[PDB]
Scaffold this active site. Structure first.
Site, PDB file in Angstrom:
ATOM      1  N   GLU A  35       0.986  -1.186   0.144  1.00  0.00           N
ATOM      2  CA  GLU A  35       0.081  -0.002  -0.154  1.00  0.00           C
ATOM      3  C   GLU A  35       1.030   1.251   0.154  1.00  0.00           C
ATOM      4  OE1 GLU A  35      -2.991   0.440  -0.574  1.00  0.00           O
ATOM      5  OE2 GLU A  35      -4.109  -1.476  -0.401  1.00  0.00           O
ATOM      6  N   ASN A  46      -7.619   8.881  -5.877  1.00  0.00           N
ATOM      7  CA  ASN A  46      -8.806   8.004  -6.442  1.00  0.00           C
ATOM      8  C   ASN A  46      -9.578   8.699  -7.561  1.00  0.00           C
ATOM      9  OD1 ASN A  46      -9.327   6.634  -3.118  1.00  0.00           O
ATOM     10  ND2 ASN A  46      -7.696   5.871  -4.424  1.00  0.00           N
ATOM     11  N   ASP A  48     -12.496   8.747  -7.893  1.00  0.00           N
ATOM     12  CA  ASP A  48     -13.747   9.273  -7.492  1.00  0.00           C
ATOM     13  C   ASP A  48     -13.470  10.664  -6.706  1.00  0.00           C
ATOM     14  OD1 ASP A  48     -12.716   8.539  -5.161  1.00  0.00           O
ATOM     15  OD2 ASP A  48     -14.147   7.117  -4.634  1.00  0.00           O
ATOM     16  N   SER A  50     -11.574  10.854  -3.910  1.00  0.00           N
ATOM     17  CA  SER A  50     -11.351  10.563  -2.650  1.00  0.00           C
ATOM     18  C   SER A  50      -9.785  10.453  -2.499  1.00  0.00           C
ATOM     19  CB  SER A  50     -11.950   9.378  -2.074  1.00  0.00           C
ATOM     20  OG  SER A  50     -11.363   8.421  -2.717  1.00  0.00           O
ATOM     21  N   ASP A  52      -6.288   8.225  -0.421  1.00  0.00           N
ATOM     22  CA  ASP A  52      -5.901   7.299   0.356  1.00  0.00           C
ATOM     23  C   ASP A  52      -4.625   8.069   0.996  1.00  0.00           C
ATOM     24  OD1 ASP A  52      -7.543   5.634  -1.158  1.00  0.00           O
ATOM     25  OD2 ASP A  52      -6.178   5.712  -2.628  1.00  0.00           O
ATOM     26  N   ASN A  59      -8.892   5.152   3.144  1.00  0.00           N
ATOM     27  CA  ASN A  59      -9.672   6.200   2.148  1.00  0.00           C
ATOM     28  C   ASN A  59     -10.533   7.007   2.787  1.00  0.00           C
ATOM     29  OD1 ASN A  59     -12.105   6.242   0.264  1.00  0.00           O
ATOM     30  ND2 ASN A  59     -10.280   6.110  -0.908  1.00  0.00           N
TER      31      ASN A  59
HETATM   32  C1  LIG Z   1     -10.115   1.733  -7.700  1.00  0.00           C
HETATM   33  C2  LIG Z   1      -9.643   0.950  -6.621  1.00  0.00           C
HETATM   34  O1  LIG Z   1      -9.785   0.013  -6.334  1.00  0.00           O
HETATM   35  N1  LIG Z   1      -9.059   1.988  -5.604  1.00  0.00           N
HETATM   36  C3  LIG Z   1      -8.660   1.567  -4.035  1.00  0.00           C
HETATM   37  C4  LIG Z   1      -9.545   2.094  -3.141  1.00  0.00           C
HETATM   38  O2  LIG Z   1     -11.144   1.415  -3.423  1.00  0.00           O
HETATM   39  C5  LIG Z   1      -9.193   1.697  -1.773  1.00  0.00           C
HETATM   40  O3  LIG Z   1      -9.708   2.159  -0.588  1.00  0.00           O
HETATM   41  C6  LIG Z   1     -10.882   1.534  -0.271  1.00  0.00           C
HETATM   42  O4  LIG Z   1     -11.998   1.960  -1.038  1.00  0.00           O
HETATM   43  C7  LIG Z   1     -13.087   1.131  -1.010  1.00  0.00           C
HETATM   44  C8  LIG Z   1     -13.936   1.648  -2.203  1.00  0.00           C
HETATM   45  O5  LIG Z   1     -14.492   3.020  -1.711  1.00  0.00           O
HETATM   46  C9  LIG Z   1     -13.455   0.851   0.288  1.00  0.00           C
HETATM   47  O6  LIG Z   1     -14.306  -0.261   0.060  1.00  0.00           O
HETATM   48  C10 LIG Z   1     -15.549   0.026   0.481  1.00  0.00           C
HETATM   49  O7  LIG Z   1     -15.646   0.093   2.150  1.00  0.00           O
HETATM   50  C11 LIG Z   1     -16.909   0.306   2.436  1.00  0.00           C
HETATM   51  C12 LIG Z   1     -16.861   0.283   4.174  1.00  0.00           C
HETATM   52  O8  LIG Z   1     -16.268  -0.661   4.739  1.00  0.00           O
HETATM   53  C13 LIG Z   1     -17.774  -0.928   2.313  1.00  0.00           C
HETATM   54  O9  LIG Z   1     -19.126  -0.977   2.875  1.00  0.00           O
HETATM   55  C14 LIG Z   1     -19.383  -1.797   3.872  1.00  0.00           C
HETATM   56  O10 LIG Z   1     -19.858  -3.043   3.096  1.00  0.00           O
HETATM   57  C15 LIG Z   1     -20.118  -4.038   3.916  1.00  0.00           C
HETATM   58  C16 LIG Z   1     -20.302  -5.389   3.051  1.00  0.00           C
HETATM   59  O11 LIG Z   1     -21.718  -5.249   2.439  1.00  0.00           O
HETATM   60  C17 LIG Z   1     -21.338  -3.724   4.971  1.00  0.00           C
HETATM   61  O12 LIG Z   1     -21.614  -4.893   5.620  1.00  0.00           O
HETATM   62  C18 LIG Z   1     -21.020  -2.569   5.728  1.00  0.00           C
HETATM   63  O13 LIG Z   1     -22.165  -2.062   6.325  1.00  0.00           O
HETATM   64  C19 LIG Z   1     -20.556  -1.304   4.702  1.00  0.00           C
HETATM   65  N2  LIG Z   1     -20.193  -0.150   5.579  1.00  0.00           N
HETATM   66  C20 LIG Z   1     -20.537   0.792   5.380  1.00  0.00           C
HETATM   67  C21 LIG Z   1     -19.932   2.084   6.308  1.00  0.00           C
HETATM   68  O14 LIG Z   1     -21.528   1.332   4.591  1.00  0.00           O
HETATM   69  C22 LIG Z   1     -17.786  -1.047   0.761  1.00  0.00           C
HETATM   70  O15 LIG Z   1     -18.717  -2.182   0.603  1.00  0.00           O
HETATM   71  C23 LIG Z   1     -16.558  -1.279   0.064  1.00  0.00           C
HETATM   72  N3  LIG Z   1     -16.710  -1.237  -1.184  1.00  0.00           N
HETATM   73  C24 LIG Z   1     -16.092  -1.958  -2.031  1.00  0.00           C
HETATM   74  C25 LIG Z   1     -16.330  -1.869  -3.524  1.00  0.00           C
HETATM   75  O16 LIG Z   1     -15.097  -2.817  -1.622  1.00  0.00           O
HETATM   76  C26 LIG Z   1     -12.464   0.353   1.139  1.00  0.00           C
HETATM   77  O17 LIG Z   1     -12.796   0.417   2.667  1.00  0.00           O
HETATM   78  C27 LIG Z   1     -11.217   1.305   1.168  1.00  0.00           C
HETATM   79  N4  LIG Z   1     -10.000   0.911   2.002  1.00  0.00           N
HETATM   80  C28 LIG Z   1      -9.392   1.460   2.656  1.00  0.00           C
HETATM   81  C29 LIG Z   1      -8.480   0.706   3.362  1.00  0.00           C
HETATM   82  O18 LIG Z   1      -9.859   2.530   3.175  1.00  0.00           O
HETATM   83  C30 LIG Z   1      -7.819   2.118  -1.337  1.00  0.00           C
HETATM   84  C31 LIG Z   1      -7.386   1.612  -0.175  1.00  0.00           C
HETATM   85  O19 LIG Z   1      -6.098   2.258  -0.011  1.00  0.00           O
HETATM   86  O20 LIG Z   1      -7.065   1.853  -2.553  1.00  0.00           O
HETATM   87  C32 LIG Z   1      -7.463   2.210  -3.986  1.00  0.00           C
HETATM   88  O21 LIG Z   1      -6.498   1.782  -4.675  1.00  0.00           O
END
Ligand SMILES: CC(=O)N[C@@H]1[C@@H](O)[C@H](O[C@@H]2O[C@H](CO)[C@@H](O[C@@H]3O[C@H](CO)[C@@H](O[C@@H]4O[C@H](CO)[C@@H](O)[C@H](O)[C@H]4NC(C)=O)[C@H](O)[C@H]3NC(C)=O)[C@H](O)[C@H]2NC(C)=O)[C@@H](CO)O[C@H]1O
Ligand code: CL
Ligand code: CL
Ligand code: CL
Ligand code: CL
Ligand code: NA
Length: 129
Positions: A35, A46, A48, A50, A52, A59
């Site tokens: 990372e 990113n 969108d 946002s 990291d 993120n």
């Molecule tokens: C293009 C690319 O891949 N870019 C990377 C970034 O995506 C990534 O940082 C991460 O960003 C993703 C996408 O925004 C994020 O994932 C989302 O996280 C949320 C929060 O946990 C999830 O929502 C939850 O889903 C569960 C399962 O259904 C539910 O039970 C829960 O209630 C939900 N929570 C909430 C609050 O609603 C999303 O489902 C999930 N989306 C996807 C598509 O996975 C990650 O959390 C981000 N990660 C970090 C570490 O922040 C970035 C990370 O460095 O890297 C980019 O390259």
């Protein structure tokens, strides 16, 4: 700050990340390597709008406030700049929330693509710990 490998392993272990939600220490070290290259000041923009932040590339769409990710959440209740500190406390405390949110370490794209399923214990080889 650019951590050494065992230096980071030790810091993560002290802050209770080792075996947290069942993820062994090597998983966390591997994730940080790919990372951020162990650099606490790492940032990446990113598609969108946002950003990291920090050693574990947390993120702003979900986890921290940077004032420039409209419509986002701040679920760790912290400024994103706190995730760039040489002290990894804020990043670890936030990572604990992230990995608990349903998807485990799949939240870290680099972990899923480069660490998951691999011999992650090798990332703590040689470390005293
Ligand atoms: C293009 C690319 O891949 N870019 C990377 C970034 O995506 C990534 O940082 C991460 O960003 C993703 C996408 O925004 C994020 O994932 C989302 O996280 C949320 C929060 O946990 C999830 O929502 C939850 O889903 C569960 C399962 O259904 C539910 O039970 C829960 O209630 C939900 N929570 C909430 C609050 O609603 C999303 O489902 C999930 N989306 C996807 C598509 O996975 C990650 O959390 C981000 N990660 C970090 C570490 O922040 C970035 C990370 O460095 O890297 C980019 O390259
Ligand atoms: Cl290394
Ligand atoms: Cl914002
Ligand atoms: Cl990747
Ligand atoms: Cl391990
Ligand atoms: Na935010």
């Amino acid at each position: 700050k650019v951590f050494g490998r065992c230096e980071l392993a030790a810091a993560m272990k002290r802050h209770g990340l080792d075996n947290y939600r069942g993820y062994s220490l090597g998983n966390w070290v591997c994730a940080a390597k790919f990372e951020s290259n162990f650099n606490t000041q790492a940032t990446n923009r990113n598609t969108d709008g946002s950003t990291d932040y920090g050693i574990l590339q947390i993120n702003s769409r979900w986890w921290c406030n940077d004032g420039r990710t409209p419509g986002s959440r701040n679920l760790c209740n912290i400024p994103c700049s706190a995730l760039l500190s040489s002290d990894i406390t804020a990043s670890v405390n936030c990572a604990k929330k992230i990995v608990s949110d349903g998807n485990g370490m799949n939240a870290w794209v680099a972990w899923r693509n480069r660490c998951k399923g691999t011999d992650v214990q090798a990332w703590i080889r040689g470390c005293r710990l």
